[PDB]
Design a protein around this ligand. Structure first.
Ligand SMILES: *[C@@H]1O[C@H](CO)[C@@H](O)[C@H](O)[C@H]1NC(C)=O
Ligand SMILES: *[C@@H]1O[C@H](CO)[C@@H](O)[C@H](O)[C@H]1NC(C)=O
Ligand SMILES: *[C@@H]1O[C@H](CO)[C@@H](O)[C@H](O)[C@H]1NC(C)=O
Ligand SMILES: *[C@@H]1O[C@H](CO)[C@@H](O)[C@H](O)[C@H]1NC(C)=O
Ligand SMILES: *[C@@H]1O[C@H](CO)[C@@H](O)[C@H](O)[C@H]1NC(C)=O
Ligand SMILES: *[C@@H]1O[C@H](CO)[C@@H](O)[C@H](O)[C@H]1NC(C)=O
Ligand SMILES: *[C@@H]1O[C@H](CO)[C@@H](O)[C@H](O)[C@H]1NC(C)=O
Ligand SMILES: *[C@@H]1O[C@H](CO)[C@@H](O)[C@H](O)[C@H]1NC(C)=O
Ligand SMILES: *[C@@H]1O[C@H](CO)[C@@H](O)[C@H](O)[C@H]1NC(C)=O
Ligand SMILES: *[C@@H]1O[C@H](CO)[C@@H](O)[C@H](O)[C@H]1NC(C)=O
Ligand SMILES: *[C@@H]1O[C@H](CO)[C@@H](O)[C@H](O)[C@H]1NC(C)=O
Ligand SMILES: *[C@@H]1O[C@H](CO)[C@@H](O)[C@H](O)[C@H]1NC(C)=O
Ligand SMILES: *[C@@H]1O[C@H](CO)[C@@H](O)[C@H](O)[C@H]1NC(C)=O
Ligand SMILES: *[C@@H]1O[C@H](CO)[C@@H](O)[C@H](O)[C@H]1NC(C)=O
Ligand SMILES: *[C@@H]1O[C@H](CO)[C@@H](O)[C@H](O)[C@H]1NC(C)=O
Ligand SMILES: *[C@@H]1O[C@H](CO)[C@@H](O)[C@H](O)[C@H]1NC(C)=O
Ligand SMILES: *[C@@H]1O[C@H](CO)[C@@H](O)[C@H](O)[C@H]1NC(C)=O
Ligand SMILES: *[C@@H]1O[C@H](CO)[C@@H](O)[C@H](O)[C@H]1NC(C)=O
Ligand SMILES: *[C@@H]1O[C@H](CO)[C@@H](O)[C@H](O)[C@H]1NC(C)=O
Ligand SMILES: *[C@@H]1O[C@H](CO)[C@@H](O)[C@H](O)[C@H]1NC(C)=O
Ligand SMILES: *[C@@H]1O[C@H](CO)[C@@H](O)[C@H](O)[C@H]1NC(C)=O
Ligand SMILES: *[C@@H]1O[C@H](CO)[C@@H](O)[C@H](O)[C@H]1NC(C)=O
Ligand SMILES: *[C@@H]1O[C@H](CO)[C@@H](O)[C@H](O)[C@H]1NC(C)=O
Ligand SMILES: *[C@@H]1O[C@H](CO)[C@@H](O)[C@H](O)[C@H]1NC(C)=O
Ligand SMILES: *[C@@H]1O[C@H](CO)[C@@H](O)[C@H](O)[C@H]1NC(C)=O
Ligand SMILES: *[C@@H]1O[C@H](CO)[C@@H](O)[C@H](O)[C@H]1NC(C)=O
Ligand SMILES: *[C@@H]1O[C@H](CO)[C@@H](O)[C@H](O)[C@H]1NC(C)=O
Ligand SMILES: *[C@@H]1O[C@H](CO)[C@@H](O)[C@H](O)[C@H]1NC(C)=O
Lengths: 303, 229, 214, 229, 214, 306
């Protein structure tokens, strides 16, 4: 809205109350969406005519964007530095009344329907030296992932392999330029944090993401990876504001399958400091999710 | 080094409340569901409570619904279980256990998958009695006395359980027989502990009775030695 | 809320044999069933998870099978230290449940004689006021054994408590302990304290005596 | 606390000279005669030199007369032995010992009465070779694996002797088997060190190989752990 | 300059027995003779001084006797940890002298079987270039034991060194170690590495194998 | 010779080069000595007729006696002498003399007991280079000598009464240095080479080793025979003979020199550490001859004559 000139402010995303608020409040919300097309097919008996008909009736439910708006008498400071790291002073700053359009999506391991990084791949951590702190990866190119209710998700293996390389490299760039980067399945735990767990409005997918995190990098099958899924409903995870409970759309109703724009890795510490580093799919902590999108905002008083 | 150490055992009078803890280590605690299981002295295993990783969803047995409270601080890697209105029937050993993850079992999605690692237990006795220290007395050998001879200790008059006995600071195991405690008429417990050694070494060796009643900060050490001057 | 049944409640079986325990659920639980083994005193251990899966580290001789409402834990070749109580658990639902008390397996071995000992009251204890005379029956089988007390040839009653270990893990032999408690006043009185034991593998009652000298 | 600590061990090439010391403590040093005794690796005990209390009278073996020099500073409670023209046959362990006083059970006035307390020895090797650091490699357990399992370390390629190995900072002794060093074809030594532990604790316990080649200021610590991921 | 003789040079003796060592000096040395005991590795210890005097702290079972040219060290009842080398020293004169090598006493016990282990080369070592495969024979008796090496069933020679501890002080059992050293180049080649051991109390050669597929 | 008036100097006996010199050089030296007596006996003849008397000379026995050695100040220097009858070695002496030569010292190698030495003038004196250092030897100097009779047969005699009393005086002057209400204990040597465990001393050529365990075996302030006899071993030690240059000096032969002398001092060493509560423990010490020389040279210091 109004770009501050020459002015620099201090950001600290790991101490940002937007994240906490946005996380306590905020539900998903779906609206009906019509995506009409036309089919015009030839009519041959002498191919004189042609019958144009409209026919993409299917009504689907689509996620509604939520914006966090600065309260009365306050504003939001926005970093425009395309490769900002969260903490520190931004030399290029804007002032907006509202954050961008966030489509809340509960999930672990993979960040869905999110904001791609503008320049190159970005990795972030509240503290890289603390192996417990979750690492947030933000691709600059989204990887399409097709999930059917039948119980499986598809991912172009070529696209994934390449996405891994980019991640591995930006990690090799954070933990010693000549380190071997290893991706391994989750070390174990509750289903939500061991599988690629995510919502499709009401229904929850648990996906065997073991094939996504099973490779070694810089160590001198099919054309499409298919993930096994279980699909369970979770009413207790439904939106509950006061007395009202909000029942999300029914099934074939909402379109499962989205775009991967981020990951949630966790680093293996201890006796892992020498020949190589090991990263496993993490998350299960939704605050990390919200930070993935709110790193570049901070709320202040309008002086 | 998957370890689960319970702490907060002891006594508590009928009606009062107690809170036990479980210092978990050697595995990302904030990723596993945790179980509380109790075992009446001499009886079977009874599942008491469960709590999922994030600490939200908790699940209780019908034998406690409304009296017990399971919780967790994924920041101190500790699991908690506070118990209110303790009856005489709650007197039991309390284990904490880690729920198996979601092993690649081909799997479906269940609430729990069952415990794998258990803690070493924590004894809780619901009694309106007071604690007491153990009096340690020797059982010396004798004078066939040309083969093997048996000696030991006598831990008498204490409360409550237990009293872990060892020999030579743990440097002697084979031959040891620590008996189950007996409940006397004075409401106080008592147990014995013996061992078998070559009588051809009843004059060139030292034996030590290492009693340890922790609930009363008692740590006695007594010497076993033949008599006759 | 699912009721679990185990069979047998208890069973004796010689070392080397094959022990079979059956689990039977009130309703279909697919293959969601775990088998636990609790030695005497120690804390429970996971042996089989989800019907038929061996934990890592668990000995090679333990196995599981079944699905639905019928399951089966099995030791191929019993070993001396396999003597414990075995529980089966279901997780198709909460609350989790087992057969309360599970199945107690105990070893049957060759009748062994009870090496009997007798320890008079410690001096340090004659002071406190109460005199406790002990009596040991070490490493014997079977568990059945009559212990008697005698003072100057006078059988005692009521004032005696005994305590017997659970079956040994190495040699599968029990050990018993009988204590005679009397005040220092009833102690000075009599001179000859005795201990008469009777065990199957003991052709005739053994005794162990002494007096308040040497 | 009668203690005699030798120092100044190490290497020295044939022809050169070396001087060893003995920090004595826990007894009036200036009142006792002191002994130097050496022991060829694997061979018997050979008395080398003696010196009376005041430091005057010195007595030597015929196997050293004119090459070795015994002395002492009764002010630093230290005993010295400088050795010149070291041959390949002088490669041995060198003990210092305190001569028994004049106990009442004696009744005549002899030159010496014999050693009572010895030092823990100091290794001296007469070699024209150079020292080298040990490379430490693990020996991990396996998968009967339902009873007891054995693990250990491998200290390979070093020089000279010795390399004192311990476990868990000394908190584990029973079961340890540190083997004698083997002389390879590369003139470098190598030894192994194993231990036996319950395989029912190969997942809840930590073991540490504490190597210490002091002649080269090496102090490695390696971890023993089962494989399969 | 006095020559000292000891007998025997070495001797095996069961625990509990009575061991007698004789010392014999070339010339009369009155009673000026000390007896020393050197365990394996450790530093010598004074047991008897001046023919027949027990040091303080020295166990009650060690004694000495004699005078002139004939002396006699004696353990009344051998104990497991008494296994060491024993020297006698004379101080009637300088230089002091003993019987070089003294008397090595070792225990005779019940033949015990060698629990055999086998450890493949550490990954950390496949890097350095040289692969060392180990083989353990733990707590066994007697000391005699043939160890063999096999790769894909191909007996090796020359490239093997072994090292055996001295007799244990607690259970009087030796422990052996055999190492097979080959370069990383001769390692990748073969798949099945084996270790065949033969011990008296081992009715038939035991083996322990594996492969580079863990 | 010439007593300095009003002048005071600084003494430090534990840094006194006389002691070092006197110790490196200096041998014993014995000269023949005739100690003649005359006897006179009456000549009784019949009854009461003892008119005459016969005077006759006796006591031929020629013995060797120790020759006194004096340390004389070099050319251009002098010796300062403390006259303070109870001086402690270190510090300023307010009464000073100037002499060309020290007194007559008869060198006698020994440990534990100081023989043929100078008695203290007033009361018993104890000295130490540092009383707080248990290692430093304590030098006792009696004011009354205790005769000790040693025969070649192999034993020394001491009037027990005289010794007991000498102990008391020592114990008291120690009780006066280590807390006025401390129990003083004398114990045998803790052990070591024969020379420092026995009362070891020379009798010219021959060396006595004496079991002085009966002299140091008592407790003081803790509320047999008439003569103590010490067992002795007598050994020759040529290496301890005087060797100046090429010449070796053979001391007199045996019955030649008269063994047995006068105890005028002791050499005690204090037991430290734990024994710092109710009682203190002292054992016979020495074996360090520099301590011996200090016993006699405490009151001298060599200076330039200005
Ligand atoms: C911002 O920085 C530029 C370049 O350094 C400077 O010239 C300018 O004065 C600053 N801001 C404004 C508003 O001019
Ligand atoms: C962007 O971010 C980087 C790294 O955090 C920072 O060093 C730099 O100053 C920023 N650049 C801009 C364009 O503000
Ligand atoms: C962010 O940038 C600042 C400097 O602009 C730097 O100090 C800080 O380390 C960076 N943070 C991360 C997480 O890299
Ligand atoms: C601020 O952001 C703009 C784009 O929004 C871009 O030109 C640059 O990163 C920044 N400009 C300044 C003031 O440097
Ligand atoms: C995305 O970022 C990576 C650096 O991690 C870069 O190599 C790649 O070219 C970028 N792709 C696009 C299209 O921006
Ligand atoms: C991050 O964590 C490490 C280890 O816990 C700590 O030493 C370091 O100070 C932390 N870094 C910051 C910036 O707080
Ligand atoms: C998913 O479906 C889309 C059509 O919308 C297709 O273009 C894409 O290739 C599929 N994604 C993958 C990776 O299979
Ligand atoms: C990417 O994946 C392919 C398989 O589809 C693999 O063969 C190749 O090594 C990978 N290439 C990269 C990016 O290194
Ligand atoms: C995991 O990765 C390995 C090595 O890249 C490969 O051989 C295998 O196909 C994968 N296995 C699993 C469990 O997905
Ligand atoms: C070091 O870096 C290179 C990439 O430049 C990588 O291929 C190699 O494997 C690394 N070194 C090793 C062997 O770990
Ligand atoms: C992601 O976005 C697409 C298109 O906006 C939507 O159809 C889909 O439902 C979203 N996926 C999830 C998991 O919300
Ligand atoms: C992924 O993103 C692109 C561009 O927004 C869109 O065309 C595609 O349908 C998305 N995939 C899904 C499943 O939302
Ligand atoms: C691995 O560990 C060492 C310390 O042992 C450390 O200094 C370094 O980072 C690594 N070593 C190498 C070869 O880089
Ligand atoms: C998921 O399935 C793969 C094979 O598709 C299997 O290797 C793996 O064990 C499973 N992972 C989990 C965590 O269920
Ligand atoms: C001397 O004799 C005494 C008394 O018999 C005795 O206690 C002691 O052993 C002897 N002293 C020494 C040190 O030989
Ligand atoms: C020397 O000292 C004395 C006593 O202090 C004093 O009276 C006198 O005047 C001084 N000098 C002389 C020799 O008179
Ligand atoms: C001699 O010295 C002592 C101290 O040891 C001192 O007290 C005394 O006063 C001195 N004598 C005289 C008469 O000055
Ligand atoms: C000794 O006596 C002097 C006087 O000559 C006195 O000044 C000093 O305090 C005393 N010194 C010691 C250490 O006893
Ligand atoms: C100096 O010494 C003499 C005794 O020899 C005597 O006069 C007195 O002790 C001292 N004189 C002084 C200065 O009082
Ligand atoms: C010697 O001095 C002491 C005080 O230590 C005293 O008791 C004794 O009577 C004195 N003897 C003579 C004769 O001076
Ligand atoms: C005296 O003895 C004490 C105790 O050892 C010591 O610390 C101090 O330095 C000594 N004083 C002198 C001057 O030597
Ligand atoms: C020492 O000799 C004298 C005679 O000179 C004698 O009177 C005395 O009794 C002897 N020693 C003792 C005290 O026995
Ligand atoms: C002196 O010695 C006698 C024994 O000869 C002893 O009984 C007495 O207690 C001592 N008396 C003194 C001077 O305290
Ligand atoms: C010390 O004196 C006591 C009598 O008081 C005597 O029995 C004993 O022999 C003496 N002690 C020693 C070590 O000779
Ligand atoms: C003084 O001497 C007595 C012995 O008569 C001793 O027992 C006591 O401890 C001393 N008194 C104190 C404490 O000053
Ligand atoms: C001590 O002095 C006397 C008399 O001068 C002498 O006869 C005797 O030999 C001396 N004793 C010693 C041991 O020197
Ligand atoms: C001992 O002392 C006195 C001098 O006080 C002397 O007359 C006597 O002859 C001396 N005896 C010896 C053995 O020197
Ligand atoms: C110091 O006094 C205590 C108490 O009487 C005594 O037990 C201890 O032995 C004394 N210290 C020494 C070293 O004698």
């Amino acid at each position: 809205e109004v770009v501050l000139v020459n002015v620099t402010e201090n950001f600290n995303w790991c101490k940002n109350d937007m994240v906490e608020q946005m996380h306590e409040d905020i539900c998903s919300l779906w609206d009906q969406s019509l995506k009409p097309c036309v089919k015009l097919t030839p009519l041959c008996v002498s191919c004189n005519t042609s019958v144009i008909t409209q026919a993409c009736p299917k009504v689907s439910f689509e996620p509604i964007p939520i914006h966090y708006c600065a309260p009365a008498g306050f504003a939001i400071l926005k970093c425009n530095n395309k490769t900002f790291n969260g903490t520190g002073p931004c030399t290029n700053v804007s002032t907006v009344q509202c954050t961008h359009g966030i489509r809340p999506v509960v999930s672990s391991q993979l960040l869905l329907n999110g904001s791609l990084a503008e320049e190159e791949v970005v990795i972030r951590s509240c503290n890289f030296t603390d192996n417990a702190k979750t690492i947030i990866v933000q691709l600059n190119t989204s990887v399409e992932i097709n999930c059917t209710g039948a119980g499986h998700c598809n991912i172009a293996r070529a696209k994934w392999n390449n996405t891994l390389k980019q991640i591995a490299s930006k990690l090799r760039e954070q933990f010693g330029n000549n380190k071997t980067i290893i991706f391994k399945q989750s070390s174990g735990g509750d289903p939500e944090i061991v599988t690629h767990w995510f919502n499709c409005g009401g229904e929850f997918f648990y996906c065997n993401s073991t094939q996504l995190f099973n490779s070694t990098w810089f160590n001198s099958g099919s054309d499409t990876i298919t993930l096994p899924c279980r699909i369970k409903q979770i009413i207790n995870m439904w939106c509950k504001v006061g007395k009202m409970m909000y029942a999300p759309p029914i099934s074939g109703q909402i379109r499962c399958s989205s775009n991967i724009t981020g990951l949630l890795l966790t680093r293996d510490g201890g006796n892992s400091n020498n020949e190589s580093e090991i990263f496993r799919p993490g998350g299960g902590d939704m605050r990390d999710n919200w930070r993935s999108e709110l790193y570049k905002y901070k709320v202040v008083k309008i002086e | 080094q998957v370890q689960l150490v319970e702490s907060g055992g002891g006594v508590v009078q009928p009606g009062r409340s107690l809170r036990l803890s479980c210092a978990a280590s050697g595995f990302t605690f904030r990723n596993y569901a945790m179980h509380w299981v109790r075992q009446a002295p001499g009886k079977g295993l009874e599942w008491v409570a469960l709590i999922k990783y994030d600490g939200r969803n908790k699940y209780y047995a019908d034998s406690v619904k409304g009296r017990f409270s399971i919780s967790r601080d994924n920041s101190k890697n500790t699991l908690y279980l506070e118990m209110n209105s303790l009856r005489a029937e709650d007197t039991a050993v309390y284990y904490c256990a880690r729920d198996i993850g979601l092993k690649g079992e081909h799997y479906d999605i269940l609430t729990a998958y069952g415990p794998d690692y258990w803690g070493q237990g924590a004894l809780v006795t619901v009694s309106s009695a007071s604690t007491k220290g153990p009096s340690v007395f020797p059982l010396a050998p004798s004078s066939t006395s040309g083969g093997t001879a048996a000696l030991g200790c006598l831990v008498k008059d204490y409360f409550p359980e237990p009293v872990t006995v060892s020999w030579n600071s743990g440097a002697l195991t084979s031959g040891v027989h620590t008996f189950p405690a007996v409940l006397q008429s004075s409401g106080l417990y008592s147990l014995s502990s013996v061992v078998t050694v070559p009588s051809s070494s009843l004059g060139t060796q030292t034996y030590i009775c290492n009693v340890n009643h922790k609930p009363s900060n008692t740590k006695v050490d007594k010497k076993a030695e033949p008599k006759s001057c | 809320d699912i009721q679990m049944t185990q069979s047998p409640s208890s069973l004796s079986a010689s070392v080397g044999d094959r022990v079979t325990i059956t689990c039977q659920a009130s309703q279909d639980i697919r293959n969601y069933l775990n088998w636990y083994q609790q030695k005497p005193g120690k804390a429970p251990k996971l042996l089989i998870y989800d019907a038929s899966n061996s934990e890592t580290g668990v000995p090679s001789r333990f196995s599981g099978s079944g699905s639905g409402r019928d399951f089966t834990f099995t030791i191929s070749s019993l070993q001396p230290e396999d003597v414990a109580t075995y529980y089966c658990q279901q997780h198709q639902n909460v609350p989790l449940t087992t057969f309360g008390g599970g199945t107690k397996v105990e070893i049957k071995r060759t009748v062994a004689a009870p090496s009997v000992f007798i320890f008079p009251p410690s001096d340090e204890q004659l002071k406190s006021g109460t005199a406790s005379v002990v009596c040991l029956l070490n490493n014997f089988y079977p568990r059945e054994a009559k212990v008697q007390w005698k003072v100057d040839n006078a059988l005692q009653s009521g004032n005696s408590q005994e305590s017997v270990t659970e079956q040994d893990s190495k040699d599968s032999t029990y050990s018993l302990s009988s204590t005679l408690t009397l005040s220092k006043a009833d102690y000075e009185k009599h001179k000859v304290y005795a201990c008469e034991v009777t065990h199957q593998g003991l052709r005739s009652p053994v005794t162990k005596s002494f007096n308040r000298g040497e």
